[PDB]
Amino acid sequence: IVGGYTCGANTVPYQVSLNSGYHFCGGSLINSQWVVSAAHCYKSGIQVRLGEDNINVVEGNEQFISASKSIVHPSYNSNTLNNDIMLIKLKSAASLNSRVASISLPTSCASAGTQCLISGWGNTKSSGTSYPDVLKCLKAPILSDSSCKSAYPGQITSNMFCAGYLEGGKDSCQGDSGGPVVCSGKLQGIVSWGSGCAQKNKPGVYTKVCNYVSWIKQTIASN
Numbered sequence: 661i662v663g664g665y666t667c668g669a670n671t672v673p674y675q676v677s678l679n680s681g682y683h684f685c686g687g688s689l690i691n692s693q694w695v696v697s698a699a700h701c702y703k704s705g706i707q708v709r710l711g712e713d714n715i716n717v718v719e720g721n722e723q724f725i726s727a728s729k730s731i732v733h734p735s736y737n738s739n740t741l742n743n744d745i746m747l748i749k750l751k752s753a754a755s756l757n758s759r760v761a762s763i764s765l766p767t768s769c770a771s772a773g774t775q776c777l778i779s780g781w782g783n784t785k786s787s788g789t790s791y792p793d794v795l796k797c798l799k800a801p802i803l804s805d806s807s808c809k810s811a812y813p814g815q816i817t818s819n820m821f822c823a824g825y826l827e828g829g830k831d832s833c834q835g836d837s838g839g840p841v842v843c844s845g846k847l848q849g850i851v852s853w854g855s856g857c858a859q860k861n862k863p864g865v866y867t868k869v870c871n872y873v874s875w876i877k878q879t880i881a882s883n
């Protein structure tokens with residue numbers, strides 16, 4: 661997150677770190693056995709880290725559970741990142757409590773202007789690189805479709821939206837994707853891609869989760 665603020669420990673109880681000997685992607689717990697992330701974060705050897713704040717120190721509240729199955733949406737396209745969504749089943753269920761909680765899936769899509777919170781342990785710098793120890797937060801609004809498509813003409817499908825700061829300075833970045841965009845207590849987006857960060861007139865592009873609720877529930881009911 662470029663231009664964000666320290667969240668505060670365990671204030672975003674649904675946020676997970678995907679780990680393979682270091683942090684590389686975010687995710688969201690949507691029930692005790694399933695995590696929603698980005699299809700682009702897929703790799704084998706994923707360990708899901710729950711209840712985290714300082715990703716480099718064991719502080720209490722953490723649950724480390726291995727991924728059992730990662731189910732990349734079958735129409736994921738890595739060149740366009742269309743349908744950038746992935747389901748991870750936990751090898752074992754998490755203990756839900758105040759610090760480890762699931763986030764609701766939406767029943768309707770959200771409108772332009774809705775404010776949302778985006779979080780992650782990704783890069784903090786637009787130029788260069790600096791990875792935080794603790795979880796960063798950013799309040800950002802969903803932008804209109806027209807503003808999104810004129811910023812990335814030809815690259816925005818119906819499964820994407822642009823949340824942020826056309827001014828620059830505030831945006832999500834590398835290592836944040838796979839993580840949550842929560843608006844009014846509903847997981848509305850997954851951090852997916854953008855042109856640099858916190859780049860002026862290049863807002864962040866996000867997977868539109870409301871388009872995927874039936875698929876998540878059917879895929880979860882059969883696995």
Ligand SMILES: [Ca+2]
Binds near residue numbers: 717718722
């Ligand atoms: Ca830790």
